[PDB]
């Protein structure tokens, strides 16, 4: 679990969105596993606007942060679940690192700010849903 709070927005994994998130929906994309809902309180997370391929992510199954090299946002296969069927998830970035069910929502950050959130994993890999292209999160 975990979310990004920037301005009047809350960014979460679409498969983990709540009734409140859906009732205050701004945008959602099943192919990216992202949902953005509106908030009354002002968020202060800074979003990165860069092409960094190195950063640090929070791994809740170890209560630790890990440094990672990650790939550029791309289309990548993801097995079924209480939430989705086999499909290509777009805007996904992979890294060699630990992740297990329960780790979704952990933030990935570089020197410029928030890069994305944990969305997939398995086999010694971790996948992050990129948010750097969502320029509207700032305005
Ligand atoms: N379709 C999706 O984006 C995910 C929906 C929930 C299920 N998905 C996973 O990958 C679950 C998973 C399995 C083994 C290790 C780590 C895992 O993820 C965690 F890091 F994000 C896929
Ligand atoms: Zn950066």
What is d(CA 3, CA 121) in angstroms, rounded to the nearest whole number?
Answer: 18
Distance (Å, rounded) from C-alpha 25 to C-alpha 135?
17
Residue 104 CA, distance from chain mean position: 7
- Enumerate the β-bridge partners of residue 120: 127
Please name every residue paired with 14 in a beta bridge, in sequence order, or none if there are none.
none
130 as an active site residue: the answer is: no
Alpha carbon nearest to ligand 1 atom 2, residue: 120
The structure tokens listed for 92 are 């996904």
User: What is d(CA 59, CA 73) in angstroms, rounded to the nearest whole number?
Assistant: 20
Q: How many CA atoms lie within 13 A of 39 on its CB side?
A: 16
Residue 93, both tokens: 């970035």
- Catalytic, 138? Answer no
Phi, psi for residue 134 in degrees, rounded to 5: -80, 70
Name the H helices within 16-134: 19-23
3-state secondary structure of 137: helix
End-to-end CA gap in the chain = 26
Name the experimental technique.
Answer: X-ray
Which ligand minimizes its atom distance to the CA of 57?
1
CA dihedral 42, 44, 49, 50 (to 10 degrees): -160
Across the chain, where does the E strand assignment appear? 4-13, 25-29, 34-44, 54-59, 64-69, 74-78, 87-96, 107-110, 113-121, 125-130
Three-class DSSP category at 15? helix
Ligand 1: nearest atom to the Cα of 81:
7
Provide CB contacts within 8 A for 112, sequence distance 6+.
Answer: 46, 48, 49, 50, 52
Q: Active site includes 65?
A: no
How many A from CA of 114 to the centre of ligand 2?
8
């Amino acid at each position: 679990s975990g979310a990004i709070y920037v301005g009047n927005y809350r960014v979460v994994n679409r498969h983990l969105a709540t009734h409140n998130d859906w009732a205050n929906l701004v945008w959602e994309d099943s192919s990216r596993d992202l949902l953005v809902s509106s908030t009354t309180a002002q968020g202060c997370d800074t979003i990165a606007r860069c092409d960094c391929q190195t950063g640090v992510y929070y791994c809740s199954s170890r209560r630790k942060h890990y440094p990672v090299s990650f790939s550029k946002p791309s289309l990548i296969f993801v097995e079924a679940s209480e939430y989705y069927p086999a499909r290509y998830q777009s805007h996904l970035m992979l890294a060699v690192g630990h992740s297990e069910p329960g780790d979704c929502g952990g933030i990935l950050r570089c020197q410029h700010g928030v890069v994305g959130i944990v969305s997939t994993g398995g086999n010694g890999l971790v996948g992050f849903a990129d948010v750097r292209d969502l320029l509207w999160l700032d305005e």
